[PDB]
Design a binder for this molecule. Structure first.
Ligand SMILES: O=C1N=C2NC(=O)NC(=O)[C@]2(OO)N1
Ligand SMILES: O=C1N=C2NC(=O)NC(=O)[C@]2(OO)N1
Ligand SMILES: O=C1N=C2NC(=O)NC(=O)[C@]2(OO)N1
Ligand SMILES: O=C1N=C2NC(=O)NC(=O)[C@]2(OO)N1
Lengths: 295, 295, 295, 295
């Protein structure tokens, strides 16, 4: 037998960083969870008890903190690229570094209508993420995403005209609730190295902002024919607004809210045009995916 | 043997309600999770297989949905009072109804700077809750709360002057991070019944808003001597602003962020005045509680 | 305003301990999560920024580890009593210690039919817990429990004869699934101090074993009229088998498994006597509670 | 723009099935969570609001329950193959079905030393899973796994000889705790269709049992040089025992248990040979992966 694939490293590394402007007093905080997994000429650690090839995961952890001390942690695309590049440059025998970063929200508080210099609120469990794959000889591949953006619209969602056969019980509808948790990923053009990533730094925050804005506005404004049709519109708009993106992927649960027929109780009318009280369904859920690229 | 205490009912009942203004087109959504547990002359269901005394939990579920259809679901203090009152009035042998409501956030989206008529975002996992105990002959006891309000300040927190003995390793500090998940509860004067609750309806939303505002502003502005000292200030302010409250309770974790000494690596300075990168600690955590009333 | 109640301390303290028999080579492991909250003459920490009265939560953490090093950690009733007693004896101004322990399962592996001397499996997420309240002048109050014991029986559960009115849709049944997560608590006679707790040490493991055995056998063998009727039988049996218990409490969710009518599809029969495929319901759930004592 | 990838279906479908032997009275229960996602000529649902190509996710749910009624649900490899095959055969335009099944444990209770005919315990949160990809023209690709198997050994784990440089603080050790949550996957030879899957049915349960047995025995008995070295031994043994497997993958967290130096307190010795009390670390964690195949 032989090792066909291997990677290893440190997961779930929580990291906070503060920036303090001593002139203005304004402080800014960043909090992440980081995973770094390495690949390379490490097979003998598995096959021969050869630990000499292992950069200890504890050392990978130390390196994450050191790198955060010595570099900006924002945008996460940049920090992940710096971190991944470090491992392939420092260790001859390491040939790929796979860096995942989850960024947690710390939004500055407004107190009495004024932004506070050092107090923050977790205003959403929504995350901003990156997956940065630094592969020796093959540059830097970056996937950026937003996830855990939970939304609901109470009308202007429809679902009719779907296939009907002997397995079908679902009624067509022209007016339903639509709710989802948005997971949206944009995949960047391959970058040749850290210089090229740095050269595009402003585009990372700008493209995240675009993706979020497009997601919310399209969700709110599209009189939706289906989750499929709405998510495609989001993706095509994001592609149109950043040429350095190659694809946009959405993964959307359809978090169902069922009508409750109450007509058995005193003829109460709570369906169709009279539907006011609904039963949110925890499970099961539709799950709708697509990846959109350019033609 | 004998039944010393008993209660039973339906937990984890998810409820959505929509209000539609047909004139303006503006829709407003509410989402809750409800628990109703009943007490009364039910001991024989336990001791003698006497199901005649059991209002089925399935029926309690139905009743929650019917009550939501026929009544406002806001403020939750009112809805819980209506719901609890129903059970003690409808069923002679039921003498208490214990209603817990967790309200989930659905905040109206702003799209292109304008509030959208039917689209919403879960802008925080923060909850607004009530515990409404309707006890026959003993009125309606209401505890209101906010929970899951997660905050951090990056300075203007201190902790020195604490007891030091042979069990103590903690260094005094004059400048640390403070982060918590706020759970704040205000306990209302007993209400005689549903008329008295209704007579105070505006005070419920107003007092929740006050509690939240005071919590945030005191957290942001207090140069904190301890979690104890800061939370007491919050409680005393809330009591001063609503005379129909009897007590305010806080339960606050101290979610520790540890400095990381990096001086072993190239003399890097990351402690004290040079501390920028910290290790958030998932566990353990301080847990600080108090209940404040009037003297 | 004034402090009506206060307690504080360290929560979520994970603790492992190993015992090594050097003669036999057999090792035995224990893993817990511990919370210790203190009460006493601490109000000035809240009202006056007086930290002198605070035994730091960090010190409470240290004390938990030191106490585990210097004492047995089993049975948890004993360890919690030692730990709580320490705080009220060491600190004049501390008058109560509230110790919660969750014990995690590490069951010794059997390999090739033989117990392994140092390898263990988390064979269930079931917990064994204690709540030990050491109150100066008022002895030691202990509540022991098992929780997270998840069970299902596929028949020999019934539910008929319940109240039927205009809120009722539930069909009577003479054959249904019953599934629950058992939370069972036994409350000990007050103990005067640590000598009296020690004098009863064997009874702690024995009573936990009895409670678990009775729970499982009664669940399996009772042709159940209701959750109420079955849980009462469990409680009365446990009381009969340990006179140093005063009460037994159960809290049981009714984790519903719904029939699925498939007769719309090719006349498939999947209800009543033909019911084979069911839809487990995540929510809502019945929740049934009682506390049984002696007459 | 154009659809580069798309799949959709129903996730989180909870399914229970009972088998009743009317002769013996013995009942046997199965509980799963199922996801089915479809691919095919569905792009127009995204690009043109063409719902005619969508088999509704609600219908996919119905189909899961119908298929469970009409077929065995065990082994899960077979059930998933039947279910996936159904969609590609029934719907001309559907060309792949991706079926994920998580099997939940319901282990028969032993009461008074005898197996009970209809009562079960969730004896572990360990899962048995399958991923069955039925792709038209490309047969049936099955990945089987066990996951959530949580283990600890208290000695006979070592970690020394790893790379040491300016990023390294970790001390070498010749005696440490090793704990992990095992996720082990075996990938089957491609099967041509449902006849070939059926022809190998006994091998599914047998290979799962082998994988579990090998995992536990190797973990317990290997005086481990590293997680890497131990997991490789597991994989090579499983490959040697089933020739219809092509690869075995492990993904193992290193769930760290740190020594606690207590020498600052009364010279207490709790490190090295005297280490008895440890601090389990919730995060971060090493994460070690490999895929082993034949040479
Ligand atoms: O039953 C369904 N209802 C749905 N709604 C939808 O927008 N698209 C689907 O394909 C669907 O996803 O959940 N299937
Ligand atoms: O070690 C401690 N550090 C703390 N900080 C604090 O504000 N109060 C405490 O009592 C303390 O709670 O966590 N104990
Ligand atoms: O609808 C109900 N079905 C139940 N079954 C039961 O055993 N007791 C109840 O009181 C009940 O609890 O869930 N209510
Ligand atoms: O610090 C480390 N300690 C480890 N132990 C191990 O078995 N292998 C590693 O590669 C290691 O994984 O966690 N890195």
């Amino acid at each position: 037998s032989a090792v066909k694939a291997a990677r290893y490293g440190k997961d779930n590394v929580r990291v906070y960083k503060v920036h303090k402007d001593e002139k203005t007093g304004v402080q800014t905080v960043y909090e992440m969870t980081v995973c770094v997994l390495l690949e390379g000429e490490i097979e003998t650690s598995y096959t021969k008890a050869d630990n000499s090839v292992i950069v200890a995961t504890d050392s990978i952890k130390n390196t994450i903190y050191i790198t955060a001390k010595q570099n900006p942690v924002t945008p996460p695309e940049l920090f992940g690229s710096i971190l991944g590049t470090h491992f392939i440059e420092k260790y001859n025998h390491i040939h790929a570094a796979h860096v995942n970063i989850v960024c947690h929200r710390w939004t500055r508080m407004d107190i009495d209508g004024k932004p506070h210099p050092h107090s923050f609120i977790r205003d959403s469990e929504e995350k901003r993420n990156v997956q940065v794959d630094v592969v020796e000889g093959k540059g830097i591949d970056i996937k950026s995403s937003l996830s855990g953006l939970t939304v609901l619209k109470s009308t202007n969602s429809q679902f009719w005209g779907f296939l009907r056969d002997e397995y079908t019980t679902l009624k067509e509808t022209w007016d339903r609730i639509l709710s989802t948790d948005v997971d949206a990923t944009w995949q960047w053009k391959n970058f040749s190295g850290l210089q090229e990533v740095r050269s595009h730094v402003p585009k990372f925050d700008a493209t995240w902002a675009t993706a979020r804005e497009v997601t919310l506005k399209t969700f709110a404004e599209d009189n939706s024919a289906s989750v499929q049709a709405t998510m495609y519109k989001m993706a095509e708009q994001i592609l149109a607004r950043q040429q350095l993106i190659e694809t946009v992927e959405y993964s959307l649960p359809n978090k169902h809210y069922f009508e409750i027929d109450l007509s058995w109780h005193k003829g109460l009318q709570n369906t169709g045009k009279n539907a006011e009280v609904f039963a949110p369904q925890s499970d099961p859920n539709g799950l709708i995916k697509c990846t959109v690229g350019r033609s």
